[PDB]
């Protein structure tokens, strides 16, 4: 295990914990705000995936300050994880190309 593959893996586990904590905390944040749809755990979990990937369909979104603060942490964990996989793939390819050039 090279750093880049350990980091990629670490980021995958950590993203899964953020999707779950974020589902829980969003529901807690959002109930009490009239009109809020982000208020049961199963679709909160769907919401957290859709936010973390940045698809953002808009079937669900938080309307409270704390729902929105939670949503910002999910966006950033998701963009960073997926960026940390791209960076780990780039590290693999560069090494392979060196080895091939005979370097």
């Amino acid at each position, epitope marked *: 295990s090279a750093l880049h593959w350990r980091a990629a893996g670490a980021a995958t586990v950590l993203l899964v914990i953020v999707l779950l904590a974020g589902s*829980y905390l969003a529901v807690l944040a959002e109930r009490g705000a009239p009109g809020a*749809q982000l208020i*049961t755990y199963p679709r909160a979990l769907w919401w957290s995936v859709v936010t973390a990937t940045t698809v953002g369909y808009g079937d669900l979104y938080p309307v409270t300050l704390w729902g929105r603060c939670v949503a910002v942490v999910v966006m950033v964990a998701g963009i960073t994880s997926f960026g940390l996989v791209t960076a780990a793939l780039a590290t693999w390819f560069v090494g392979r190309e060196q080895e091939r050039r005979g370097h």
Partner: antibody
Amino acid sequence: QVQLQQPGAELVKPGASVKLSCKASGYTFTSDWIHWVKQRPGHGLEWIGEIIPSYGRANYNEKIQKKATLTADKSSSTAFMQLSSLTSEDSAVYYCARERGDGYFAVWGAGTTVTVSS
Amino acid sequence: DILLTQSPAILSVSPGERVSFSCRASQSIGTDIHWYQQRTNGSPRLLIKYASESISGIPSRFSGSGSGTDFTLSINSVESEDIANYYCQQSNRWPFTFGSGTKLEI
């Protein structure tokens, strides 16, 4: 098993308060909300409010005069609703129900009949 | 806050016949509608959740249907144990609200 356990009745004097209770058993998750519903004699059900015992966070029906204050004791698996400064408009049956956070009341208490009289 | 309208308030059917209770929502709530039975001096009892999904415990006689603003609980072959008050409740938007309710009467 009986999952929610409520007292059968309380008498309360006009202007007095009372602390209703609800002892849960069976599966008691972190994810669980306890709800309180008020049924006046020959009327329908009114959602009054909800507490999550794990966090102790509570929301109320703001469409009505606020009489309730929801508290949970996580050690004794018990939800409380303090109803204060009661008139006769407040005479009713109050149920607790358990919602798993997917939006429906799976399991109800038998309810507490609260009579406000002198 | 969402408004659950249950009309009519009383429903008179003959023994063995099919009965339908209506719930109309004031704005679209998908299928986030659940139905409770309350017999004289009983607690409410979940019958249907998510509009059409069965709860085990419940005679197959009980069905539900509907999507958006129009929901229906059905009892195919009403029997005497069905005499009760039927309520709808939505979980689409905060807070949870109930219907005004419908008395079945044989």
